[PDB]
Amino acid sequence: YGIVELDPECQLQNTVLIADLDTEAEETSIHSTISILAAPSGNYKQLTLMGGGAKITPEMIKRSLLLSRVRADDLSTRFNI
Amino acid sequence: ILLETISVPQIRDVMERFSVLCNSNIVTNSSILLGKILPREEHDIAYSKDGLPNKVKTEDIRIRAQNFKSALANLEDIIFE
Amino acid sequence: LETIEIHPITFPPEVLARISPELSLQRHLSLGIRPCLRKYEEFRDVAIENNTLSRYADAGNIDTKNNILGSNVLKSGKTIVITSITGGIIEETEDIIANYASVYPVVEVERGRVGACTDEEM
Amino acid sequence: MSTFIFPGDSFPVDPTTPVKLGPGIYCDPNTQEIRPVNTGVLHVSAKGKSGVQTAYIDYSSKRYIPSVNDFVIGVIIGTFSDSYKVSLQNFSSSVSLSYMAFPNASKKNRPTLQVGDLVYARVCTAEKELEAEIECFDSTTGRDAGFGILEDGMIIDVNLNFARQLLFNNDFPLLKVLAAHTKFEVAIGLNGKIWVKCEELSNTLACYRTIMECCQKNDTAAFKDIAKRQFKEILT
Amino acid sequence: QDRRRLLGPAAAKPMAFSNSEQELSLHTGFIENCNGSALVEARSLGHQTSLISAVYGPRSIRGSFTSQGTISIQLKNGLLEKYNTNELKEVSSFLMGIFNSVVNLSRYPKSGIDIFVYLTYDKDLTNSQISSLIPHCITSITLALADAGIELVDMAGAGEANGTVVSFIKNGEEIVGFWKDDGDDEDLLECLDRCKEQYNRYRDLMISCLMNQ
Amino acid sequence: SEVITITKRNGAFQNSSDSQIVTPGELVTDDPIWMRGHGTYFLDNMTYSSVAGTVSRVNRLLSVIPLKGRYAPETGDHVVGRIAEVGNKRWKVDIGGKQHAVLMLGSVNLPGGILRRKSESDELQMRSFLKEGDLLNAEVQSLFQDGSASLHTRSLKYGKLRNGMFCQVPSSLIVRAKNHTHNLPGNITVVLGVNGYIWLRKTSQMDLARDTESSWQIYSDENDPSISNNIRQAICRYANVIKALAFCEIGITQQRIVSAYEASMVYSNVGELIEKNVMESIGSDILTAEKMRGN
Amino acid sequence: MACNFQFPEIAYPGKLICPQYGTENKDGEDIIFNYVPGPGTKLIQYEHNGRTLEAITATLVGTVRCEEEKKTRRTVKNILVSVLPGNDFANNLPKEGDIVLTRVTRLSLQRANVEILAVEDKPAATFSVSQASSDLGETFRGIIRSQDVRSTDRDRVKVIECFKPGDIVRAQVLSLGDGTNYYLTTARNDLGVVFARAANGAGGLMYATDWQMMTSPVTGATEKRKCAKP
Amino acid sequence: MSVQAEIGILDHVDGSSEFVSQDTKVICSVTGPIEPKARQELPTQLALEIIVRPAKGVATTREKVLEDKLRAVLTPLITRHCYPRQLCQITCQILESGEDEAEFSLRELSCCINAAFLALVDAGIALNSMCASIPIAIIKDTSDIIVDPTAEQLKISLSVHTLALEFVNGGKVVKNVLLLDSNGDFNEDQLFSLLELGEQKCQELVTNIRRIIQDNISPRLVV
Numbered sequence A: 001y002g003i004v005e006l007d008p009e010c011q012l013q014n015t016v017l018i019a020d021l022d023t024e025a026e027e028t029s030i031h032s033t034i035s036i037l038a039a040p041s042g043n044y045k046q047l048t049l050m051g052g053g054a055k056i057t058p059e060m061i062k063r064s065l066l067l068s069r070v071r072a073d074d075l076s077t078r079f080n081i
Numbered sequence B: 001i002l003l004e005t006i007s008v009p010q011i012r013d014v015m016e017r018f019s020v021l022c023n024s025n026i027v028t029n030s031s032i033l034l035g036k037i038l039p040r041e042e043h044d045i046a047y048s049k050d051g052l053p054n055k056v057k058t059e060d061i062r063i064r065a066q067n068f069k070s071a072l073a074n075l076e077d078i079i080f081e
Numbered sequence C: 001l002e003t004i005e006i007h008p009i010t011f012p013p014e015v016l017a018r019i020s021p022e023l024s025l026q027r028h029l030s031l032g033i034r035p036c037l038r039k040y041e042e043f044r045d046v047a048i049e050n051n052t053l054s055r056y057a058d059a060g061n062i063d064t065k066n067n068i069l070g071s072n073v074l075k076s077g078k079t080i081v082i083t084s085i086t087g088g089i090i091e092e093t094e095d096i097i098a099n100y101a102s103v104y105p106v107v108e109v110e111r112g113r114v115g116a117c118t119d120e121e122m
Numbered sequence D: 001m002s003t004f005i006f007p008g009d010s011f012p013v014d015p016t017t018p019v020k021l022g023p024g025i026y027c028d029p030n031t032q033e034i035r036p037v038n039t040g041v042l043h044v045s046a047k048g049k050s051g052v053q054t055a056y057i058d059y060s061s062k063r064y065i066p067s068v069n070d071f072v073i074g075v076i077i078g079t080f081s082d083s084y085k086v087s088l089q090n091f092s093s094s095v096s097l098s099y100m101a102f103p104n105a106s107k108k109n110r111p112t113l114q115v116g117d118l119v120y121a122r123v124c125t126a127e128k129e130l131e132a133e134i135e136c137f138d139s140t141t142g143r144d145a146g147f148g149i150l151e152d153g154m155i156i157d158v159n160l161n162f163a164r165q166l167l168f169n170n171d172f173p174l175l176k177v178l179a180a181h182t183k184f185e186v187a188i189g190l191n192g193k194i195w196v197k198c199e200e201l202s203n204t205l206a207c208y209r210t211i212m213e214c215c216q217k218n219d220t221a222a223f224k225d226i227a228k229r230q231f232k233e234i235l236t
Numbered sequence E: 001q002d003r004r005r006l007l008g009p010a011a012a013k014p015m016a017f018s019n020s021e022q023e024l025s026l027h028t029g030f031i032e033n034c035n036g037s038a039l040v041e042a043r044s045l046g047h048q049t050s051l052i053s054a055v056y057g058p059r060s061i062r063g064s065f066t067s068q069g070t071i072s073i074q075l076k077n078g079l080l081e082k083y084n085t086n087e088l089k090e091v092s093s094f095l096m097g098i099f100n101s102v103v104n105l106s107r108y109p110k111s112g113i114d115i116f117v118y119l120t121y122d123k124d125l126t127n128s129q130i131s132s133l134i135p136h137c138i139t140s141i142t143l144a145l146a147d148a149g150i151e152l153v154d155m156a157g158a159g160e161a162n163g164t165v166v167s168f169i170k171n172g173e174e175i176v177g178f179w180k181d182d183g184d185d186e187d188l189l190e191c192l193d194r195c196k197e198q199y200n201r202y203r204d205l206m207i208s209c210l211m212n213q
Numbered sequence F: 001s002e003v004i005t006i007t008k009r010n011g012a013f014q015n016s017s018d019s020q021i022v023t024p025g026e027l028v029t030d031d032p033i034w035m036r037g038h039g040t041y042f043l044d045n046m047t048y049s050s051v052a053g054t055v056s057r058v059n060r061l062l063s064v065i066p067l068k069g070r071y072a073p074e075t076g077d078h079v080v081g082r083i084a085e086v087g088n089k090r091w092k093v094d095i096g097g098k099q100h101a102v103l104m105l106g107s108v109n110l111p112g113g114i115l116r117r118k119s120e121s122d123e124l125q126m127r128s129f130l131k132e133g134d135l136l137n138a139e140v141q142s143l144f145q146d147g148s149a150s151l152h153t154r155s156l157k158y159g160k161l162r163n164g165m166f167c168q169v170p171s172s173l174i175v176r177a178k179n180h181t182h183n184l185p186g187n188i189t190v191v192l193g194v195n196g197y198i199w200l201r202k203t204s205q206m207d208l209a210r211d212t213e214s215s216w217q218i219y220s221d222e223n224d225p226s227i228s229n230n231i232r233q234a235i236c237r238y239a240n241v242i243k244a245l246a247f248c249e250i251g252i253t254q255q256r257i258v259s260a261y262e263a264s265m266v267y268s269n270v271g272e273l274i275e276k277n278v279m280e281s282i283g284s285d286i287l288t289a290e291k292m293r294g295n
Numbered sequence G: 001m002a003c004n005f006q007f008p009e010i011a012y013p014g015k016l017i018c019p020q021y022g023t024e025n026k027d028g029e030d031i032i033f034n035y036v037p038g039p040g041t042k043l044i045q046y047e048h049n050g051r052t053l054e055a056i057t058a059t060l061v062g063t064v065r066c067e068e069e070k071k072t073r074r075t076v077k078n079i080l081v082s083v084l085p086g087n088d089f090a091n092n093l094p095k096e097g098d099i100v101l102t103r104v105t106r107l108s109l110q111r112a113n114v115e116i117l118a119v120e121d122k123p124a125a126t127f128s129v130s131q132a133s134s135d136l137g138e139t140f141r142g143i144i145r146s147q148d149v150r151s152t153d154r155d156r157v158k159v160i161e162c163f164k165p166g167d168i169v170r171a172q173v174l175s176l177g178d179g180t181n182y183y184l185t186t187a188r189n190d191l192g193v194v195f196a197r198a199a200n201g202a203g204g205l206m207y208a209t210d211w212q213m214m215t216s217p218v219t220g221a222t223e224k225r226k227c228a229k230p
Numbered sequence H: 001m002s003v004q005a006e007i008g009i010l011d012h013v014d015g016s017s018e019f020v021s022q023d024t025k026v027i028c029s030v031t032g033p034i035e036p037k038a039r040q041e042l043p044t045q046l047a048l049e050i051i052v053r054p055a056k057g058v059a060t061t062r063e064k065v066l067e068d069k070l071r072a073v074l075t076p077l078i079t080r081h082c083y084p085r086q087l088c089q090i091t092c093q094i095l096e097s098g099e100d101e102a103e104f105s106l107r108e109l110s111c112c113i114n115a116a117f118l119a120l121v122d123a124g125i126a127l128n129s130m131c132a133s134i135p136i137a138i139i140k141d142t143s144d145i146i147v148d149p150t151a152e153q154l155k156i157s158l159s160v161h162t163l164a165l166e167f168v169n170g171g172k173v174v175k176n177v178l179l180l181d182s183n184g185d186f187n188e189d190q191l192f193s194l195l196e197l198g199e200q201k202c203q204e205l206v207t208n209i210r211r212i213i214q215d216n217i218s219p220r221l222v223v
Ligand SMILES: [Br-]
Pocket: C104, E005, E006, E007, E008, E009
């Protein structure tokens, strides 16, 4: 997961949590990131917090942990392995 | 040879021999191992409050793409200082 | 009392992404989306195929000239990952870490280059 | 006991007061806030100085960074088409010394400086994202302002603080305690280089050893004794 | 052992165990990392092969200057069947000669076209084998180059018959490469005909793939 | 030897006014008055040799001329060179010395010549005049401090080479002369560079006018569209006899070449001139011919 | 801008398109069509029936397009035959005269080193983005000399006041140069710094208010750069 | 939290330090800003060359991970835009593991972060703020959260943690969490209890570091 601050001078037509980083644009410009290894049981095996950009708040951590569980539940049961 | 050196009967001759040459030259690729998995297009999912994954439609992403392109080009607006 | 208007130079999404990745990100985020055309909390889908490369793929017709014990071909979005497990044997002579083993992985990220192992792979 | 400041700490001076920022102090281009980025003693100039107060941080360092109007000691390490390639410090980015940056310069006659020569020069331009430049003359008058080649002698490595004190502080006893032992001429560079030359090698060597030890101890009330035992030890 | 990889314990020893004409599958442009890519899978008798090609170029070459482009081809061992590095180099050289006769190099000054062919999955089910993989490599490289947008004089294809490999262009009129290991004596004419039949079939499927897909 | 001549040998890796010869470290003289030149070094009164060669005394300049060494460019030499690289506003051309010679953009004749107006696009389009691999005539205009040569082609005599073939001999076998371009029987012309680089081409109108719209095509890679086989087979023959003279350590001159060319006519096929015994005899016949013609 | 009906619609590498020359009869006069090998095609000499023949052959996979271009008595129309695929920096490699979008990587006292990121295509305008990586030096590098910065006063030009590291400079190709560096220019009104941030990307967005001055709407602080005419 | 550090111990480096926590001793050196290699050059920012050397044997992929995590901490700390197209070499020589290196690298990483920071301070390189790192572990049966655990405590641990925070305002305001490297079995409640106690001991460490920095550097400066 990644955390970015919305820049007022870039709007078309205040932090945001982004899930599953892809594309050069996100890998290059997002310096606050979270990596999780979550077991479907409910516990966690790995939790990496790297805050080089926006401040990593407890809310951002909790939301990430929640999504990691939801993602883990999906990946574990999907392919019946 | 060069242009102007060549005459009209010579051109129609060339057109003739070409038509002769052109008209003289005249099972499905089912997967074996990695044929189903590798060329598979990108799909995206969203996890609702239920924790269940939800399929994001392809055309939704295509429209999402073309709408941004119009909002970036035409909807560039004017910057006042 | 000096009021001046400026016409901002615009660029196609692909050009902008190459010119300024940071700006390309912020532009997308202002419309609730991301440069990869996904929303803030949308994950990439996942498709896998297990044991397709293993010698134990067909229980009826076990391969003889194969040493792969297990395998997995995974594709998520546009990225493809191919994993194969092989084995070896060595002579030997609570929940503490001293009672657990691991696998020895060699990852290769094909990026069209040739040479030593990158810092990414290591 | 001194008033130490650390990076990230709140800047004492208020925005209502016009402040000229020196070394150690950083003005964030994005948030416009003024914040200290170096560790040391904060120095703020008294008010009344033409309505502008100068604030900076004295921090310990030995890696020189080129700034305009600095007297430095460089060494010629290369000769390009229109300028010299000169090193102000080992492993640092090279500086350029133009062939026209000399007294009595001409497009027909290049200077006679060879690679390996020491030059006392002044930094004329020091852009952050560009190769810095030095000059060996006065840009307005055209004369040599004591700039140019340093014949023979010995050069000494010294931390930027020790060199700055030796050049700008008159209360620094080092030049005095050395004059009480022998005659000597000295060039002082803000890039942490000190050039010393006497009539005899034994005296230059004695000066070298004193300056080295004094730089190491950094105890002002001990320079006279160090010079005493050094010039004595040479006599043996 | 190695300070750049995790190869495990040294006292460990690898596990040793005791005791139509062709079916094709073609796919192009599935690797976003490069300019052109291809997937070629073939199944026949007691041997199936799944190889992947990837073309990187035209990219920068910071050395002197060249009026035309420079092609490089590298074959990599896959997961299952391994080959000698020498043998992979030899095929690479043989492939370089072929595509230096097909790629319109004049259109890419001071540029480099680096072509990678991954011998991903080569299964030997028989309960110099490299000769039977060569025509599939040429097919993959041709597909990848065309998918990359690199100009080609003609669709280069090939065939294999009794250890003899020969690649054709121009409806099989001319030859861009000839390879022969083992085989028999005075069997040149028979091999040329059999390979041209494979060349024609491969070329049709390639064009069908480059168009419809 | 119908197809290939293979000479064999067993049990061996290989076959096995006086000029004063000196070796490195050898004492040449002990007279401090001497001015020490190349090939020497000194310590007080003693002058030693740095190379293996013959002691040379010109006036009060003592030097030792080496037995071997690369071509040393003198100012005013007529050399043939190949463009090694192109940069900024100059070319670097391979002459065959220790260093590449330089050829400034202002030292050549631009196409269209005196009528051409100066353009700042020429320095960015130098590759349209002389690119890597091109051969050319050039004169050693000046010399650098180390000894490197600065070339120039400011003449109709000098310029890009075509309509022929290249071959090279050791520079020691070609000396300085009044002129190095020569016309030979068979309608071919030789260009004997002092550096040992030789160019054999079909005789052009300029080559004839030497002893008796075109300025736009002085850098064209295109050859003469009409070159007869008799000229081509002449070039091959002249090439082989030059290699034959070189094989026998015989100094190449315009007379020696023509003499060898006519003497080689004994052999029907031109390819017979590549064999050792043929080369040795041809060179030997030239030396003996000069013997009984000189005395 | 219309090919004859005897031409193929789709094309793959090796497919014949048309002879080198064509002709027709209109209004009692014979019109001569001079077909020129364009991008994606090449004149190839084939043999058939014993007599040789040179015909336009497609070298790419895509559609065939034709366009007329020019720059006793007889009339001749020159037609340009090309093949367009149907993003790809390949077929549109930077050539002399082309306009490109570059990024300044290093400034020197006499020149400005950049890397080509995209090339302008010929009829908003279209672009072809280089897919190469700027992290591995995979991108074609170029050089903007000090005398090619602007048109007026090319003798006295300070590089530090024209460009800055990270700036996105729109330039035009002068020559291919060597294998290392292209040679570019910005000596026109629509050339120069197009996109930039204050303090080398450490600040906010700057727009080209003046042709020689870039300002930030938020901070108000300005910087001196050789900007493209707004 | 009885750590001990020394500053400016190396002669041929712009800055150096020696950080010691229990048995874990790491010496660090920093040279910069200096001329960078072409492949290292960054047009606008400073390039970091980060090297980690093990106490035993040669550098392997293990230390390559230590270099990577140490990079994540030092990168946002340094005001890199002050040094465009320039290089800063940062070398860490772990002298004593203070832990079973075959199982853990916890204490070595924290000690490298603290030492690198101190070396950057000594070298006089522009820093946006301060920083402190501590190793934390959770024991098997007791499940207690032990800050700065011993090697023997690690052997009987269920999870190991590296916490490095970014401090401003005289070491009182946590600007951000530079690095949190949690490994092993743990739940959400344990995580925040870890972060709460971890922040306290980190803040105590900065205060101690600030003391060490001033004690060593002030004699060099003038009043
Ligand atoms: Br291992």
